[PDB]
Paper text:
To understand the provenance and biology of baculo-like viruses, we have determined the structure of the nucleocapsid in the intact BV of the prototypical baculovirus, Autographa californica multiple nucleopolyhedrovirus (AcMNPV). The ends of the tube are sealed by the base and cap substructures, which share a 126-subunit hub but differ in components that promote actin tail–mediated propulsion and nuclear entry of the nucleocapsid, respectively. The nucleocapsid orchestrates key steps in the infection cycle including the packaging of the genome, membrane envelopment, actin tail–driven trafficking within the cells, and breach of the nuclear pore upon genome delivery.
The building blocks of the tube are flat, diamond-shaped dimers formed by two triangular MCP subunits. The fold of the MCP is novel and has no identifiable homolog in the Protein Data Bank (PDB) and AlphaFold databases of predicted structures. The MCP face exposed to the outside of the tube is composed of a helical domain and a four-stranded β sheet. Unexpectedly, each strand is held together through a small interdimer interface burying only 660 Å2. Similarly, interfaces between the nucleocapsid strands are relatively small but stabilized by a potential interstrand disulfide bond. The lasso forms an antiparallel β sheet interaction with the lasso from the next strand (right inset), whereas the zinc finger extensions from two neighboring subunits project toward another, burying only 483 Å2 but potentially locked-in by a disulfide bond between Cys29 residues (right inset). The baculovirus adopts a stabilization strategy analogous to the HK97 chain mail, which is based on an extensive network of intermolecular disulfide bonds that covalently cross-link the entire body of the nucleocapsid. The intrastrand cysteines are conserved across the viral family, whereas the interstrand cysteine pair is specific of alphabaculoviruses. Thus, the entire tube is a covalently interlinked container, which is expected to be extremely stable under oxidizing conditions. Thus, the MCP dimers form quasi-equivalent contacts in a manner analogous to icosahedral particles that follow the Caspar and Klug principles.
Author numbering:
A (entry chain C), B (entry chain A), D (entry chain O): 15 to 26, 35 to 253, 262 to 320
C (entry chain M): 15 to 253, 262 to 320
The structure:
């Protein structure tokens, strides 16, 4: 079925994770390519050897990158600047306009293809098929659609200042302006700092690794320098690369046995309040509204 | 050769990684048993694939544990209260008193066992063998030895307020009161938040997971609730486990393919300033004092 | 013969036998008195030959060096051959071997440091046997190289046929400059190293000016032989086990296969940046054709 | 294919690089013979052993030449004086008038051939074959055509005073007036002093060996004396060569091993800007207009 938003890309690369019903509705290949994220899972173990897996993502922004280059999911206002849509294929640009609820851009995309001779020669069929698949996925991920199955069990607040009072701050207000698909992406990628299951409160990370502002979900720590994150044909791209000159064969030989702690930067931000009457363990992806 | 300080425990259990020349000079089994840490490695990757490994430890204290239960490596003042040395074997008490450079307790331990009938034969030899092994390990880890290969190469500060100015805080001056073995343990367990290799500064974690206090190495976050870390045959104990009640097989099957991000809480604290001229990649484990 | 100033390198302690990492080109009597590998290691350069063709095919070949420092390097890292004042700071002599410290302290004529070097080793028991001979052999080889290079030797082959100036403001009038007066402060070996490593902008064989390069790629300053351009950003120059040092490597992500295959048989212009600086007047009665090394003082 | 410009020369010798589609459209022999330049590759490297072949062109003007003898690519105004194109065969003169877009010269050439007895009998088939071939090659090099496969990702400014501000100057203003083929030749031959790929700027040579003025791309250096560059049948030459009378036959043996730095004067002038989106590594000869 290939439940990925960028699956319907054809002239007018999906990873095998698209077939899985994870709820992301995007594959890790496309996630890395577009939103500078790599999907992971957060095994929230119990004291007893029982567990439940919560989706998480690691941002792929380097330490030296600054400014717009640190934005993972831009807002609807500035998604044209971050993504450089004109470089992408017209199908990708149409899908991105749909994802960010840009009706005018979608209309312009449709209009510029009308002047083509072949638009009615099976090209309109392709455009409408891509649009229909993308809109079906969006409606699947949108709680506001007609007769939409929605879950009110989990309250997700991206501002922990007053989260325990069952209310959010400015960050959660900006989160509501997002589309349903982007809200789902941020909910899945950004695992909460605090997960309050019933009365119990669990804290996974000391402080946030990302911030939501007018520029969207930004892969920047709230204070201080940014964390050290180590990471198209016929395109000349030049990147500054940190390199260690020393020989490290003997060090890896000595420290081989011990378990390795990843140097990735997982996306942690906000508060999650799972209600006592929750169905959080279902595997059907009922979209969640805060 | 079992290079574990607690491998000499004998009446008057070491993991296989003790034999490895990791530099901890303590096995993972004994680290878990005594200091509430499990040895790990931190693979520091380039922007290329070349990597070098640093040793870190993940503390095993719970969310609900408060007070002395959160101390990982207690100070010389309060290590008596934290460890409850009476329960463990007298050889273990001798090793601990040698670790904390408490001469009066060592002398009392020697005096108490002098009155036994078997002290002269097959006991004093054992106590002196334990003493010699512990003292050799201490001298290996002590930079103030007669001819010690001390290293001014890496400047490891445990306070980042004035660390960039090559100064230290209160925690750093409290760190110097520790013995050679304890200083080596804290260096090999408490990873640096920042690793300023030459001019380049690499921030490994946004916030510190532990703080050095008057009570010792405390596994307490600087602010907010403590992080969620889920973890004597005849002794009766109560754990108050936080059981998770629900069916998670379906969810675990759904999210199987994706890489698992560990839920462990590692020890990140302080600032490491590696000098331009360094011999970091050696595996000889020279004391490496500040 | 291995006429490399660092070919005398050896571990003073006889327990460790340290072979000299010396390039095969050191045995040549070119006049560098330093091997390619040692000039790559210290005094960051690569020994090159600059063939100055005549108008016809017959040619005479000069020696020049290309500084290996990068674009991003600033401050001390820019200096290739430091001045005698700050050569200790630039080189970090503590990390180097004792033979290297001795050679470098002799190169800059720092007698106090050399006396200190032998004072530190005078205390050990092994100094009397199998180490005094080693230190004296290193000193003798370095002193012989310096004296061969020194124009102030007892009977030196000092040659005034070719005049080499390092300031071009008034070099046509055979007058020196601030950089040249700083150049005279260097010892003989450093002067020859700079002369063989730096080529003039305006060669002036007889009265025939021969401008090698438009603008200088190096400047002699108070800090030393600086690999810094006179103005603007620095030139783009692409470029010890158990040591962990950052690199900041710049990487190209393109395919480059089709572009490389496109231009197959076209002579490749090098990207190397050689040291061009000064004004080497040559007299009508010169003897530049000779192959025997000479100090070549002003 | 013989894509060279003067390949079609018959009455109304190219080095085997005419068949190669390197985008030059003129053989190295024909470049030397016509424009006093040469074909050489400038392999811009990086810290990693990788490269992309950008093309350079040494100029063949000697040290002592003055005035119009130093010009490599004269302007459309004074190409009659600089080139003495009349002396060449009428095919070469016609193709040169084609290159500089002089319709009066071309149709005067046509008028002269009309009165010949052979024009109506198998001569127009030659002159218009030459005209059509050369106009086709020019249009392939000309960016502004009906169907323009132009690339606007890169920007070339031959004036560096305000080049970093994405503007040009007098030199670039006089540069735009050139023909498509002439602009292509100046672009390919003259490598930029500064190559700003994305945000990182690379400087290859300190000073501009060639200066653009009204007389054309002049080999003269902007300051000081000219650089030292050592290099028609039945026409004896009053030619002056340099007198190096030394032996210089064993000194080469003393310096045979080392690598030889070429004494060729390359063609450096101006500042080239490349954006993040670029297709430089393609071999389709994007006309690359400004
Ligand atoms: Zn996909
Ligand atoms: Zn053990
Ligand atoms: Zn050598």
């Amino acid at each position: 079925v290939n439940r990925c938003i960028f699956a319907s890309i054809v002239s007018f690369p999906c990873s095998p994770d698209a077939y899985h019903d994870d709820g992301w509705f995007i594959c890790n290949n496309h996630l890395i390519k577009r939103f500078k994220m790599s999907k992971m899972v957060l095994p929230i173990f119990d004291e007893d050897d029982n567990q439940f897996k919560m989706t998480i993502a690691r941002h792929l922004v380097g330490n030296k990158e600054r400014g717009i280059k640190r934005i993972l999911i831009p807002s609807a206002t500035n998604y044209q600047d971050v993504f450089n849509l004109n470089s992408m294929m017209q199908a990708e640009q149409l899908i991105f306009h749909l994802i960010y609820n840009n009706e005018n851009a979608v209309n312009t995309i449709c209009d510029n293809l009308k002047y083509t001779e072949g638009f009615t020669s099976n090209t309109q069929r392709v455009i409408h098929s891509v649009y229909a698949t993308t809109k079906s996925i969006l409606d699947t991920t949108n709680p506001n659609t007609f007769c939409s199955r929605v879950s009110r069990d989990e309250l997700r607040f991206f501002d922990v200042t007053n989260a325990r009072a069952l209310r959010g701050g400015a960050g959660d207000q900006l989160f509501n302006n997002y589309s349903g698909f982007l809200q789902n992406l941020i909910r899945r990628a950004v695992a909460p700092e605090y997960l309050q299951i019933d009365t119990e409160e669990l804290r996974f990370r000391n402080c946030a690794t990302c911030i939501i502002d007018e520029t969207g979900l930004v892969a920047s720590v709230p204070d201080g320098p940014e964390l050290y994150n180590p990471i198209q044909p016929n395109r000349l791209q030049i990147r500054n690369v940190l390199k260690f000159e020393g020989d490290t064969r003997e060090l890896d030989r000595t420290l081989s046995g011990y378990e390795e702690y990843p140097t990735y930067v997982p996306l942690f931000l906000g508060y999650q309040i799972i209600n006592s009457e929750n169905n959080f363990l279902r595997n059907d992806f009922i979209p969640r509204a805060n």
